[PDB]
């Protein structure tokens, strides 16, 4: 269960 972050791009 990831998630889009603006920091780069999908983290979990």
Known sequence: ???LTRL???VC
């Open 1 to 3: 269960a990831c998630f």
């Open 8 to 10: 780069g791009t999908y």
